């Protein structure tokens, strides 16, 4: 139904690990992966997300469903008929969790008599099912209504003692909740594996698995693994002694560029200094596996948008990450005045306008102020909580990040402004 149609069907979910929504559009380890596959294949790529895990499984399994599911699934049901799992392209390893400081639980056995939340329909919860055999004392709880971030960051407040998530996903998230701790591994280590439907036509499992053959040994994989784990996303706050030094060293360099983009686009030059500093600490070489480049951090699609041949150039980069960012800002609903208007041009500057608008409209459903920086900043870090994105137009985002993004720079803006 592939090349004779054009469309190559994948379902997933959307989730930081998998398929998600970014500023540049579409994104996520099992996005790009995909999008490799069709590509090989010569076929367009349609994503489709499910709800929930049981779904997932459920329309893969219907006659006529998405031609396979890329979705960070564990192969299971060996027996299942209806699901193939296809060779393994990112070892895992199933991980107990438990928030620091806390008594850490270290056997199977010790896992009863505390509260545990996994997903429903994931192999986590089948794992427990069969713990729950060997002790039957064992009590846990799954939902269709949360993603592993809601289940770690349940475990860091405290609202659940533990959960069971496989090791790629902490790795990923780790940062984000600083208070989750790995009690122990449970299970062998496993490879994650795509889903395909039974169980007679080999065509596509073939393709699938010469692809992921290929991937690795010409180290795709690998590179995937780089880009999606590791990164930091928004940089943290230098803090007052490092930003004077680059104030001393490195800001004179481009200071000159700042102040004509300033004049040309009519704008504050510190506040594009400021950006420059939070995208790159003024460092017109840097460079990022996320696919972003020069002192204002453009992607390819964004550079030539704004006129720019040489991402790696100061003066075109600030130019056109300036022109980009006053673009933004004039293109905001008119009912947002300055100065909360380039607030949220900074914040659609990191997250986009989209995931933008779903905060705006969020904030006005719960009684606040869209036109409002203070208030829609509160909505934004709701984006990364299932019970809150599964409700809106573009989904699931780190949205935290992007008021960590805008603080920083007002507050780079502000030390500028000082030191005139």
Do not use: C
Not at 191 to 212: I, K, Y
Not at 221 to 227: C, F, I, N, P, S
């Amino acid at each position: 139904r592939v090349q004779k149609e054009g469309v190559l069907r994948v379902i997933t979910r959307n989730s930081p690990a998998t398929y998600f929504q970014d500023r540049n559009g579409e994104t996520g380890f099992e996005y790009e992966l995909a999008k490799r596959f069709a590509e090989r294949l010569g076929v367009e790529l349609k994503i489709e997300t499910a709800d929930n895990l049981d779904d997932l499984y459920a329309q893969l399994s219907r006659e006529g469903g998405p031609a396979l599911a890329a979705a960070g699934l564990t192969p299971g049901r060996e027996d299942d008929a209806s699901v193939r799992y296809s060779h393994t392209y990112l070892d895992v390893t199933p991980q107990i969790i438990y928030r620091n400081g806390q008594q850490r639980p270290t056997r199977p056995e010790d896992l009863v008599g505390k509260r545990i939340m996994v997903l429903k329909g994931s192999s986590h919860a089948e794992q427990l099912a069969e713990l729950k055999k060997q002790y039957p004392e064992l009590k846990y709880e799954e939902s269709d209504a949360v993603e592993v971030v809601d289940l770690l960051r349940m475990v860091d407040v405290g609202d659940i003692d533990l959960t069971l998530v496989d090791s790629n996903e902490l790795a990923m998230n780790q940062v984000y909740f600083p208070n989750v701790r790995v009690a122990f591994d449970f299970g062998e280590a496993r490879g994650l594996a795509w889903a395909l439907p039974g169980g007679d036509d080999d065509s596509l499992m073939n393709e699938v698995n010469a692809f992921l053959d290929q991937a690795k040994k010409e180290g795709l994989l690998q590179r995937l693994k780089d880009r999606y784990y590791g990164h930091v996303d928004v940089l943290g706050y230098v803090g007052a002694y490092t930003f004077t030094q680059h104030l001393q060293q490195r800001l004179p360099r481009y200071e000159s560029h700042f102040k004509q983009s300033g004049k040309q686009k009519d704008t504050d030059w510190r506040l594009l200094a400021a950006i420059g500093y939070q995208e790159s600490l003024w460092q017109p070489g840097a460079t990022s596996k996320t696919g972003v480049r020069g002192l204002m951090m453009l992607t390819n699609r964004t550079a030539q948008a704004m006129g720019v041949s040489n991402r790696l150039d100061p003066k075109q980069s600030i130019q056109g990450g300036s022109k980009y960012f006053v673009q933004i800002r004039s293109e905001l609903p008119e009912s947002i005045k300055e100065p909360d208007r380039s607030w949220f041009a900074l914040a659609a500057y990191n997250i986009g306008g989209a995931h933008l608008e779903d905060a705006r409209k969020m904030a006005e459903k719960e009684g606040l102020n869209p036109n409002k920086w203070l208030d829609v900043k509160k909505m934004l870090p709701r984006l990364a909580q299932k019970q809150w994105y599964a409700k809106t137009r573009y989904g699931y985002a780190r949205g935290g990040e992007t008021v960590h993004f805008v603080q920083n720079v007002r507050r780079y803006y502000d030390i500028l402004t000082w030191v005139t």
